[PDB]
């Protein structure tokens, strides 16, 4: 699911791209011609208007993590029998290291 | 008085204490009441730090309330020592051991040893302690316990060679997860389909 919102956001940067470079081109055609001021044409618009909803979109969905303000469902499903052993004492003194020191 | 036990008990036993080699382990066997001591199989009790009463107190009765269903009765418990140099039983075993044998007449004390326990098992590699209230405490040098010794060292080595015995689960477990049974279905399956 990401792959597919990450390609839509760079779908919808590469049709801002295309139509930055249309409005590009249309302000050097203006430029040619005296006077006519006109504005840029409104279906341009309505694109880069499309391409600004479409990838507003999905960067919002890319980053969601929002984990729960409480932190007993966090420790709610951990038992005690792992809480029980500790990492810093630790005894290499078992039954399994005797039963297994000949394979 | 001779003591005999089904190799269906020892299997478990041994098969519980190889799932948690690092830490204490405690079991229950079971006989018929209805002169040799007969055992029928035995059930693992808890493991870890193997100090605490109140849930033993639990265990025991909901032990007790499955032996008046089936017509059972408590025979022994057993218990094996975390350090390998550790052939001694421990206070609560002998408190345990003499509030069963205020019922039951007949109660032996099973430590299981750490320093002959490897893969390819000689034989008997268990103690059997006989106490009372009074100051009675004495272990038997050796005997024959189990039936069918060739055949028994065929089947445990059979199920500790192949990775089966993750299966096996404990009281603690039920009370973690009530989806797991504690009377060891498919390792009665197994035994029965190995013999």
């Known amino acids: 699911?990401?792959?597919?919102?990450?390609?839509?956001?760079?779908?919808?940067?590469?049709?801002?791209?295309?139509?930055?470079?249309?409005?590009?081109?249309?302000?050097?055609?203006?430029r040619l011609t005296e006077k006519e001021d006109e504005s840029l044409p409104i279906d341009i618009v309505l694109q880069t208007l499309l391409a600004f909803a479409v990838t507003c979109y999905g960067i919002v969905h890319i980053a969601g993590e929002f984990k729960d303000m409480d932190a007993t469902s966090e420790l709610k499903n951990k038992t005690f029998d792992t809480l029980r052993n500790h990492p810093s004492f630790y005894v290499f003194n078992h039954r399994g290291r005797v039963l297994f020191r000949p394979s | 008085p001779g003591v005999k036990l089904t190799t269906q008990a020892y299997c478990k036993m041994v098969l519980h204490g190889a799932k948690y080699p690092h830490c204490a382990v405690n079991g229950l066997l079971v006989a018929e009441k209805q002169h040799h001591t007969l055992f029928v199989d035995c059930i693992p009790l808890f493991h870890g730090t193997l100090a605490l009463a109140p849930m033993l107190e639990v265990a025991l009765t909901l032990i007790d309330s499955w032996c008046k269903d089936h017509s059972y009765v408590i025979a022994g418990y057993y218990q094996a020592n975390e350090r390998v140099k550790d052939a001694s039983p421990?206070?609560?075993?002998?408190?345990?051991?003499?509030?069963?044998?205020?019922?039951?007449?007949?109660?032996?004390?099973?430590?299981?040893?750490?320093?002959?326990?490897?893969?390819?098992?000689?034989?008997?590699?268990?103690?059997?302690?006989?106490?009372?209230?009074?100051?009675?405490?004495?272990?038997?040098?050796?005997?024959?316990?189990?039936?069918?010794?060739?055949?028994?060292?065929?089947?445990?080595?059979?199920?500790?060679?192949?990775?089966?015995?993750?299966?096996?689960?404990?009281?603690?477990?039920?009370?973690?997860?009530?989806?797991?049974?504690?009377?060891?279905?498919?390792?009665?399956?197994?035994?029965?389909?190995?013999?």
């Open chain 2, 90 to 195: 421990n206070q609560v075993a002998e408190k345990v051991a003499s509030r069963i044998a205020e019922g039951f007449s007949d109660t032996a004390l099973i430590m299981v040893d750490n320093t002959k326990f490897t893969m390819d098992c000689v034989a008997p590699t268990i103690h059997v302690y006989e106490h009372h209230e009074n100051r009675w405490r004495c272990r038997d040098p050796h005997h024959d316990y189990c039936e069918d010794w060739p055949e028994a060292q065929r089947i445990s080595a059979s199920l500790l060679d192949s990775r089966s015995y993750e299966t096996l689960v404990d009281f603690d477990n039920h009370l973690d997860d009530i989806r797991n049974d504690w009377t060891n279905p498919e390792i009665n399956k197994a035994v029965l389909h190995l013999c």
């Open chain 1, 1 to 30: 699911a990401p792959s597919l919102w990450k390609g839509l956001v760079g779908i919808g940067l590469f049709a801002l791209a295309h139509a930055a470079f249309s409005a590009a081109q249309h302000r050097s055609y203006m």
